[PDB]
């Protein structure tokens, strides 16, 4: 729509795609079934989003309050966009990189910034597989190592579960600014981590489609068994109806949309351009949109499935809470009145505490009673890592075959977090042979830039990466591919190709929505982003053993230096659109 | 330590395997 002179021959022409398929069997890889492309694409989204970010904000912003908004957004800028980018990399017969220099030779930021953001998010992704690992490794032990502390102050303040998450695996010290050595244990788990990513991701696709078999189905076999036990727990269906129940208070804040956003273009694995390059392998006549519209259907089905397991899980906890927390009210009375034991129950509590303050309000003042409610504990969200480290580590301690349970919860979580770092391999090692030795060159130069994260400090500099790398740059990339697939390609040939690839064209409906409200969406979220920083003074959680309440969140404002890393992260992938697109117009 | 030596083992199994894969590479000829 804008000037795009000479946009043919950079691209392949219709007449000869026919004639590019038959020639093009050497020096470009070929998908084996469409099952092992299809299950490929399927493994790296949910892997990518239900290994830990998802099920992160449904239970921190307690349940539909979040979901709704994510499923809202899910539809009208996410179906849009994972159907964009499978017909866009199937008529282009390119990855992001060469898409997007294709489309047009200044728009290279955009490929760039998608390796980036690629490069940036897989970082620190096989630095949660490895504390997942960890975990796995240290599950095979009939006393789960987080059911006992070792009792130690720490470990006594703090749970036998959160003495083993902050002492035990992280070794946490009180601040970013306090950084220790390389904790030796965690790096084994990371060099394991990055060992097993170069084990499947050696010569690309063709070995990585033998792996995603396993890989894209343990997640949900095994999520399937966890309904079954989730339902079963006490606490379920206390919790599930708790995330039945939304609260618009969350809804009317800008940051829930924002969270719901930028989750969109998580749990579809949009603006990585690691799917760009997986449909670029399809046959030219493989029907992509069918492709897409299934993709989506799976995707909002099973984080709907995580979110009501996790939920389930809450709940228990938090009835087990509930019951323990009541019980030690009943004791501190039937003991400081001698009460005839299993006297006073749930039924005649609140009767027996005003019976017995009549009969020695003296003896009765002294008793001191928590408010042990069942809703807060619900209400009683976990911040970081800490629903698979803290909430889920801790449940199943409380479950018959605890070790089992351990096993298969970290197993599922591993599987989902490979599953991720296959596509987002594929969004590096490629924009890499567009510009196994190769594949191995990443695996070491990453697996030592991850030394970062097995410091003391190593968690809170995981937090800013979590919080920026993979936040604002996906949905501005996500904005761009939209609009310069539209408004610089053309819309109009983008409906001639769609017709000569899947043998028809996209629904008025569908065509509009891309066309304009996915876009516009996409600036409310970019909107809704600024707001909650300017809004918001940077800060972080920390955890100082030995400080005035320390089982609460200290939160401290991180460094002024901090802030130069976060204008980074966050800042060159997304400025490469521009600052390319402004050095093409004076080269 | 049981962790130590899972850990091991798995290390083991996949070095093993990528030596198997890099070999199999060499082997296509
Ligand atoms: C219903 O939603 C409201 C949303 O605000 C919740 O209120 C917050 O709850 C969290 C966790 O208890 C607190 O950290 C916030 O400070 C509260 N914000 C305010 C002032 O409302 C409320 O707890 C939710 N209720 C249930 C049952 O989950
Ligand atoms: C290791 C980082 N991951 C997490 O904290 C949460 C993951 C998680 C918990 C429960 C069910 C599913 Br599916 C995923």
Same mark, same amino acid.
């Given at each position: 729509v804008l000037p795009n002179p000479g946009l043919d021959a950079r691209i392949p022409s219709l007449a000869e795609l026919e004639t590019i398929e038959q020639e093009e069997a050497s020096s470009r890889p070929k998908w084996d079934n469409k099952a092992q492309y299809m299950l490929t694409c399927l493994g790296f989204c949910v892997g990518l989003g239900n290994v830990w970010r998802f099920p992160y904000l449904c239970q921190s912003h307690g349940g539909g309050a979040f979901m709704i908004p994510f499923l809202i957004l899910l539809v009208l800028e996410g179906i849009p966009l994972l159907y964009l980018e499978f017909a866009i990399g199937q008529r282009l017969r390119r990855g992001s990189l060469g898409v997007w220099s294709s489309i047009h030779?200044?728009?290279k930021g955009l490929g760039l910034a998608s390796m980036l953001t690629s490069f940036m998010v897989g970082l620190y992704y096989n630095t949660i597989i490895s504390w997942i690992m960890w975990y796995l490794f240290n599950?095979?032990?009939?006393?789960?190592?987080?059911s006992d502390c070792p009792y130690v102050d720490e470990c006594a303040r703090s749970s036998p579960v959160d003495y083993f998450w902050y002492?035990?695996?992280?070794?946490?010290?009180? *601040?970013? *600014?306090?950084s220790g050595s390389i904790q030796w244990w965690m790096l084994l788990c990371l060099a394991c981590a990055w060992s097993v990513l170069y084990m499947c991701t050696i010569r690309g696709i063709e070995t990585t489609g033998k792996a995603v078999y396993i890989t894209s189905t343990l997640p949900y076999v095994v999520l399937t068994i966890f309904l079954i036990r989730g339902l079963t727990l006490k606490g379920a269906t206390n919790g599930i109806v708790f995330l039945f129940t939304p609260n618009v208070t969350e809804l009317a804040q800008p940051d829930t949309w924002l969270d719901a956003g930028a989750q969109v273009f998580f749990s579809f694995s949009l603006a990585f351009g690691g799917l760009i390059s997986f449909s670029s392998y399809? *046959? !030219?006549?493989?029907n992509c949109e069918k492709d897409s519209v299934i993709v989506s259907i799976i995707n909002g089905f099973t984080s709907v499935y995580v979110a009501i397991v996790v939920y389930s899980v809450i709940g228990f906890r938090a009835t087990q809470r509930y019951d323990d927390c009541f019980s030690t009210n009943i004791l501190t009375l039937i003991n400081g009145f001698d009460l005839?034991?299993?006297? !006073?129950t749930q039924e005649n509590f609140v009767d027996m505490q005003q019976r017995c303050n009549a009969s020695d309000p003296a003896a009765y003042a002294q008793l001191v009673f928590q408010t042990c409610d069942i809703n807060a504990f619900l209400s009683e969200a976990v911040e970081?890592?800490?629903?698979?480290?803290?909430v889920f580590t801790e449940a199943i301690t409380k479950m018959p075959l605890s070790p089992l349970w351990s096993v298969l919860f970290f197993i599922m979580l591993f599987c989902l977090g490979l599953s991720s770092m296959f596509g987002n391999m594929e969004g590096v090692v490629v924009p890499l042979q567009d510009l196994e030795v190769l594949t191995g060159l990443i695996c070491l130069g990453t697996f030592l830039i991850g030394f970062i994260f097995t410091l003391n400090s190593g968690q809170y500099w995981l937090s800013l990466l979590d919080s920026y790398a993979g936040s604002i740059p996906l949905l501005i990339i996500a904005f761009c591919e939209m609009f310069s697939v539209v408004y610089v390609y053309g819309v109009d040939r983008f409906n001639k190709d769609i017709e000569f690839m899947i043998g028809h064209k996209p629904n008025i409906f569908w065509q509009v929505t891309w066309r304009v409200v996915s876009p516009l969406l996409m600036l409310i979220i970019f909107l809704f982003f600024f707001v909650v920083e300017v809004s918001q003074e940077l800060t972080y959680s920390i955890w100082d053993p030995?400080?005035?309440?320390?089982?609460?969140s200290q939160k401290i404002s991180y460094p002024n230096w901090v802030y130069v890393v976060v204008v980074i992260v966050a800042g060159v992938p997304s400025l490469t659109i521009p600052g390319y697109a402004i050095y093409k117009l004076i080269r | 330590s049981i962790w130590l030596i899972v850990f091991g083992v798995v290390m083991g199994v996949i070095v093993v395997g990528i030596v198997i894969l890099i070999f199999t590479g060499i082997r296509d000829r």
């Open positions: 030779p200044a728009l599950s095979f032990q009939e006393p789960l190592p987080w002492r035990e695996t992280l070794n946490i010290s009180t *601040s970013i *600014s306090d399809n *046959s !030219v006549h493989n005839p034991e299993g006297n !006073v970081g890592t800490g629903l698979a480290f803290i030995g400080y005035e309440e320390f089982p609460k | -």
